Amino acid sequence: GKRQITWQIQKNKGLTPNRKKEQRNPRVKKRKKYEEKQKKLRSVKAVYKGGEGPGGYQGELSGIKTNLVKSVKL
Amino acid sequence: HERRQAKIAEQIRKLEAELVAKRAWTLAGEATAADRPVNSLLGEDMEFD
Amino acid sequence: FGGSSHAKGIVLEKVGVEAKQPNSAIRKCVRVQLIKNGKKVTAFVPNDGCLNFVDENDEVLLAGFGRDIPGVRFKVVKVSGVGLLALWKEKKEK
Amino acid sequence: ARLVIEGVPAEFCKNFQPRMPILVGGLSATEDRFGFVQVRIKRHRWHKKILKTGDPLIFSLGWRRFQTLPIYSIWDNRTRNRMLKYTPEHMHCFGTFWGPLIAPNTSFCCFQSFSASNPGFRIAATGTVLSVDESTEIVKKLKLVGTPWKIFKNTAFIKDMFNSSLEIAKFEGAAIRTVSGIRGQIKRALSKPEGYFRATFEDKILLSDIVILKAWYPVKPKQFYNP
Amino acid sequence: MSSLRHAIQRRAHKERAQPLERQRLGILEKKKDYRLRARDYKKKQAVLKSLRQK
RNA sequence: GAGAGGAGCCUGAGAAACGGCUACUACAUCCAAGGAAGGGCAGGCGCCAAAUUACCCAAUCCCGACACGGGGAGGUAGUGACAAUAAAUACUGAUACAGGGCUCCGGGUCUUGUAAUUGGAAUGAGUACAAUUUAAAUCCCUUAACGAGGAACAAUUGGAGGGCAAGUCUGGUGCCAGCAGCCGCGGUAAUUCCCUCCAAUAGCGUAUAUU
Numbered sequence: 048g049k050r051q052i053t054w055q056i057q058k059n060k061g062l063t064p065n066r067k068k069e070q071r072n073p074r075v076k077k078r079k080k081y082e083e084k085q086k087k088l089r090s091v092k093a094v095y096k097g098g099e100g101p102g103g104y105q106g107e108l109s110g111i112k113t114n115l116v117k118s119v120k121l
Numbered sequence: 122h123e124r125r126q127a128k129i130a131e132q133i134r135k136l137e138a139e140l141v142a143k144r145a146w147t148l149a150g151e152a153t154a155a156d157r158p159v160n161s162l163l164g165e166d167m168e169f170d
Numbered sequence: 171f172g173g174s175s176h177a178k179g180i181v182l183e184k185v186g187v188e189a190k191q192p193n194s195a196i197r198k199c200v201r202v203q204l205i206k207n208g209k210k211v212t213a214f215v216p217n218d219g220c221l222n223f224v225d226e227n228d229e230v231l232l233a234g235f236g237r238d239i240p241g242v243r244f245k246v247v248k249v250s251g252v253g254l255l256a257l258w259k260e261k262k263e264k
Numbered sequence: 265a266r267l268v269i270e271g272v273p274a275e276f277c278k279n280f281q282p283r284m285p286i287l288v289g290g291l292s293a294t295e296d297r298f299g300f301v302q303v304r305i306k307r308h309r310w311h312k313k314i315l316k317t318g319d320p321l322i323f324s325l326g327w328r329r330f331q332t333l334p335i336y337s338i339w340d341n342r343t344r345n346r347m348l349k350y351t352p353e354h355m356h357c358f359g360t361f362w363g364p365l366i367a368p369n370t371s372f373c374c375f376q377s378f379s380a381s382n383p384g385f386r387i388a389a390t391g392t393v394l395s396v397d398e399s400t401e402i403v404k405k406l407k408l409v410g411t412p413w414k415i416f417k418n419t420a421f422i423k424d425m426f427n428s429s430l431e432i433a434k435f436e437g438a439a440i441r442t443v444s445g446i447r448g449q450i451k452r453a454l455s456k457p458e459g460y461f462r463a464t465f466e467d468k469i470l471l472s473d474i475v476i477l478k479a480w481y482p483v484k485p486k487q488f489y490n491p
Numbered sequence: 492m493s494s495l496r497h498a499i500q501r502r503a504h505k506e507r508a509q510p511l512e513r514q515r516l517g518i519l520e521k522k523k524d525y526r527l528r529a530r531d532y533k534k535k536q537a538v539l540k541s542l543r544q545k
Numbered sequence: 546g547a548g549a550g551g552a553g554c555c556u557g558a559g560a561a562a563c564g565g566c567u568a569c570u571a572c573a574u575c576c577a578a579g580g581a582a583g584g585g586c587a588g589g590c591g592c593c594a595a596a597u598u599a600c601c602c603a604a605u606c607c608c609g610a611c612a613c614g615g616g617g618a619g620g621u622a623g624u625g626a627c628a629a630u631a632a633a634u635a636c637u638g639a640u641a642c643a644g645g646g647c648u649c650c651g652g653g654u655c656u657u658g659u660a661a662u663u664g665g666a667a668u669g670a671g672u673a674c675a676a677u678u679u680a681a682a683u684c685c686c687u688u689a690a691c692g693a694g695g696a697a698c699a700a701u702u703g704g705a706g707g708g709c710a711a712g713u714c715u716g717g718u719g720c721c722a723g724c725a726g727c728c729g730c731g732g733u734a735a736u737u738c739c740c741u742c743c744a745a746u747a748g749c750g751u752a753u754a755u756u
Binding site: 492493494497498499500501502503504505506507519521525526529530532533 | 703704705706708709710711712720726727729730738739740
Binding site: 052055 | 309310384
């Protein structure tokens with residue numbers, strides 16, 4: 048019949064900023080950060096990502112643009 | 122004294138009857154002409170721009 | 171104020187509790203009686219909520235800055251031993 | 265030393281036990297004067313409820329323990345102490361009650377019950393005593409609300425708000441407001457639709473709008489006190 | 492500061508709808524809808540002002 | 546090397562032995578006021594508080610009529626984010642829906658998300674039978690058994706930025722702008738509502754001296 052102490056009493060969190068489950072583990076946070084910055088480098092530069100796959104060249108998917116010269120003058 | 126806690130107990134009964142009972146229109150913070158009595162806006166005293 | 175890093179003090183008058191702006195520097199600054207020096211310097215309490223904790227006559231530890239009144243120079247860090255940010259959060263009583 | 269006191273009841277005589285100790289607490293005249301006490305309530309961090317104004321409390325001030333009812337109120341931008349209805353969570357309001365006077369900077373404790381059956385943390389509120397007075401000046405916003413009846417360009421006959429031309433004439437220069445953020449002025453009582461009137465506004469309002477008068481009705485705290 | 496602000500000091504405050512009687516009459520214009528009809532009317536009267544000067 | 550203090554004395558194999566006598570010198574305790582016994586370091590506070598008033602001679606060793614009896618050497622443990630070291634707070638699928646996601650004024654790229662629905666394995670913190678280690682305990686080494694679904698077994702410290710009321714305050718040639726807002730009509734067993742980014746990450750901030 049003893050008065051049990053509650054959880055905020057035991058751990059005085061008080062008023063802390065609400066943080067993330069991904070921030071809870073630092074290894075998960077750098078895993079989800081590298082996946083995003085691997086994703087953003089796909090948008091900027093050109094990654095190899097294998098040659099022709101199984102089907103064998105269904106054409107230049109995602110279009111062909113004829114005016115554009117994506118090259119370094121040398 | 123039992124006299125003191127008796128009369129104080131009566132005043133407790135009156136007040137907690139007022140806490141149970143309804144809220145007057147001056148304290149319900151948005152009053153209208155349907156809510157209040159007829160010339161009951163006239164008798165009070167407020168502060169407005 | 172270059173010999174020591176934190177100075178104790180007496181909260182002398184909460185300067186400008188009658189201001190209108192809730193987080194202006196007028197409301198934030200507090201008059202302080204320095205103990206060992208004897209001077210009176212005002213210091214920034216970093217919130218109006220923390221100003222609700224800074225009370226009269228209390229022993230209050232202050233520090234400096236580093237970077238509405240540019241020129242008030244110190245900073246209230248503790249009130250009666252307990253840290254003022256730990257009073258601002260619900261960490262400790264006093 | 266010995267202390268002889270006349271006039272002690274048979275509850276303390278006929279129910280005395282040496283388990284519960286006895287204090288001899290030293291009042292002053294200020295501690296013997298009733299009146300209104302202005303008080304800086306903060307809720308406790310580990311009280312779970314919030315504290316209504318009209319709900320009574322048990323107080324730890326001075327030497328004695330009250331059951332009196334406060335009025336919580338924020339000195340909101342320092343022009344009025346506008347009456348709240350609850351204690352703010354995690355913030356210092358200005359409570360005010362009727363009890364004995366105490367000198368300021370008297371830090372104090374606050375309770376909702378003297379019962380052992382509270383499943384957690386009986387302490388209600390903690391703070392410091394701000395000042396003392398009689399005749400408080402605590403203010404609560406009363407709004408008088410009403411509907412546009414006819415809509416001209418800048419004027420508007422509005423309705424359902426005042427009951428009579430006497431009331432219109434009492435408020436016949438008042439700042440009225442539309443919840444679109446549209447100010448206006450009560451001009452004159454419209455004659456035959458009794459209680460309706462004519463206001464003017466800074467622009468054209470809609471029938472969907474709702475027209476408010478933000479007045480400030482005064483609030484007296486109740487006295488009642490018992491230890 | 493923004494670091495010196497709590498999480499209850501960032502709660503969005505709730506806009507209040509109309510009473511169920513006025514729900515017939517429509518949307519309670521609060522500040523947004525007022526600014527839409529005010530800027531639209533200002534634009535109309537600006538064009539009509541230019542045409543009257545023509 | 547010198548030791549309540551000068552002055553003398555005695556023992557022994559070895560001492561000018563003092564934590565042993567005799568006076569004198571400076572204090573001070575029990576008394577039935579004549580008499581007697583009396584002459585250390587450690588602990589706490591100090592010149593607002595932070596390292597146990599721990600357990601043993603079991604080892605190694607020392608001393609005595611001497612296998613027993615004795616040991617303030619030594620050993621065993623407790624606290625400790627001052628450091629220093631290792632590294633938890635999860636891993637992996639499936640489908641459904643969505644059509645944009647991202648990057649530099651107009652450009653450049655092609656699969657991305659979900660507070661979406663479900664399915665799998667993995668358990669280590671801890672709880673802990675035992676036995677063992679030990680002077681005795683503990684740690685260790687073994688160890689049967691329980692031991693994960695977020696509202697939990699409940700990661701922090703700093704900073705930057707967005708949004709918000711029938712609220713508030715201030716300025717002014719309407720309807721704008723500012724600072725700001727735990728505070729709003731009702732309601733407290735009343736309500737179920739809004740965050741994003743950066744850094745270090747069981748560690749991090751702040752102040753001054755500064756280099």
